[PDB]
């Protein structure tokens, strides 16, 4: 078969930037090169085919080169200056024998530094019937991605009990939001009384703690 | 209006073999060839095979052992059948539009089904439990409020949460789900309002796992 390689496997850039994305065929496929767009939980778009064809209702900020050979294998995808919804992982395609993609290069944005916003939320009542005890932690709309969350309860730290999730990066504004939960049996929960998450991150000039009072109004 | 759309179960256990069904609307099958493409997080995009309106078929080689494809042109569909499924089967996968008779070279993906989330497992399948993330005094900043909805506990992916039947979109934030030590996914889904409006806004987190069809419909006040 005919096997596509891509690079880089992620690129960083920021708004207005001009970015460019490669792949080579192990073998010759002439113009017969496709680039699609893919965003997470969605299907790929194709934007671009025989190599330097846009597709429809694809942005003219977006093109397709190579050497116009029929010898070719090397492409590159080129977006002359990015904009906030092109974050997205690219993919590139041949189909000059069986179709076969290469591996994808992830594409993030670069903006400004912003803080999270932190809330902490308690377990509720009905979860409690149950026997065990969720506490979350939001740290919301905030760049770079790199955070660290730590959780206390009555000041003592916790390992191993928690575990995170990091939204894509907005493709409006180039955001992340992050969810620490911490994960209690019912009686520790209630044997406790002060639950905290302290965050850290770039743009805090010192860590933010959040905490509420099990029972206070 | 062409428009690909994708069914069939999304949880199987090894050694089950794989059904998957797409329909097409806005024009019938003739003129294109019709593939299944996989995505997997350790192999990626795969292409699987294709099948055109008269029954042919072309297999990816490193599916012919396993797969089969048939097409229902009264119904404008066609399938997908993978036998013997392992684990590295599990992935998306989608239905696409390819080459087009009228041009030898034509095959790119110009039109996609939705995908379908397919997991190969031993666990059976669970809904989710879900819980308010009450909005509270420790939930708000400079006229900002945070609430959201914690979906926990279910099996397999994927849980679809949307917000007051879809009418509140703006600032919502849903997490990619992680799996639990227990086995479970769990994930939550927030959203920032003004504070003034935890006043008087009814705020429902509407919560669809398909896999199990179970749905809740869970009112976030503050406590």
């Known amino acids: 078969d005919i096997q596509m390689t891509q690079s880089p496997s992620t690129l960083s850039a920021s708004v207005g930037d001009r970015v460019d994305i490669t792949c080579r065929a192990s073998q010759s496929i002439s113009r017969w090169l496709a680039w699609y767009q893919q965003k997470p939980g969605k299907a790929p778009k194709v934007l671009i085919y025989?190599?330097?064809?846009?597709?429809?209702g694809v942005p003219s900020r977006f093109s397709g080169h190579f050497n116009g050979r029929e010898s070719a294998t090397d492409f590159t995808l080129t977006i002359s200056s990015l904009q906030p919804d092109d974050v997205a992982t690219y993919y590139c395609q041949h189909y000059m024998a069986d179709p076969r993609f290469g591996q994808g290069t992830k594409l993030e944005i670069k903006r400004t530094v912003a803080a999270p916003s932190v809330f902490i939320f308690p377990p509720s009542d009905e979860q409690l019937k149950s026997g065990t005890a969720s506490v979350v932690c939001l740290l919301n709309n905030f760049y770079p991605r790199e955070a660290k969350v730590q959780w206390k309860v009555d000041n003592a730290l916790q390992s191993g009990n928690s575990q995170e999730s990091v939204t894509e990066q907005d493709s409006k504004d180039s955001t992340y939001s992050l969810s620490s939960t911490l994960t209690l049996s019912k009686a520790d929960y209630e044997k406790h009384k002060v639950y905290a998450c302290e965050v850290t991150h770039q743009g805090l000039s010192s860590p933010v703690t959040k905490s509420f009072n099990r029972g206070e109004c | 209006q062409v428009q690909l759309q994708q069914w069939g179960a999304g949880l199987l256990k090894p050694s089950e073999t794989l059904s998957l069904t797409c329909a097409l609307y806005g024009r019938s099958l003739n003129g294109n060839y019709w593939s299944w493409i996989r995505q997997s997080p350790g192999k990626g995009l795969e292409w699987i095979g294709e099948?055109?309106?008269?029954?042919?078929?072309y297999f990816n080689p490193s599916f012919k052992s396993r797969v089969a494809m048939s097409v229902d042109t009264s119904k404008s569909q066609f399938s997908l059948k993978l036998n013997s499924v392992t684990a590295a089967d599990t992935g998306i996968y989608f239905c696409?539009?390819?080459?087009?008779?009228?041009?030898?070279?034509?095959?790119?993906?110009?039109?996609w089904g939705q995908g379908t989330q397919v997991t190969v497992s031993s666990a059976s399948t669970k809904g989710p439990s879900v819980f308010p993330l009450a909005p509270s005094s420790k939930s708000t900043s400079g006229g900002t409020a945070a609430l959201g909805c914690l979906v926990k506990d279910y099996f397999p992916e994927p849980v679809t949460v949307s917000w007051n039947s879809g009418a509140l979109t703006s600032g919502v934030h849903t997490f990619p789900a992680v799996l639990q030590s227990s086995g479970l996914y769990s994930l939550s889904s927030v959203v920032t309002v003004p504070s003034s409006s935890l006043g008087t806004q009814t705020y429902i987190c509407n919560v669809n796992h398909k896999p199990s069809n179970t749905k809740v419909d869970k009112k976030v006040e503050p406590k």
């Open positions: 696409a539009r390819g080459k087009r008779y009228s041009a030898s070279y034509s095959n790119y993906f110009g039109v």
């Open positions: 099948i055109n309106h008269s029954g042919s078929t």
């Open positions: 025989e190599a330097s064809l846009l597709a429809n």
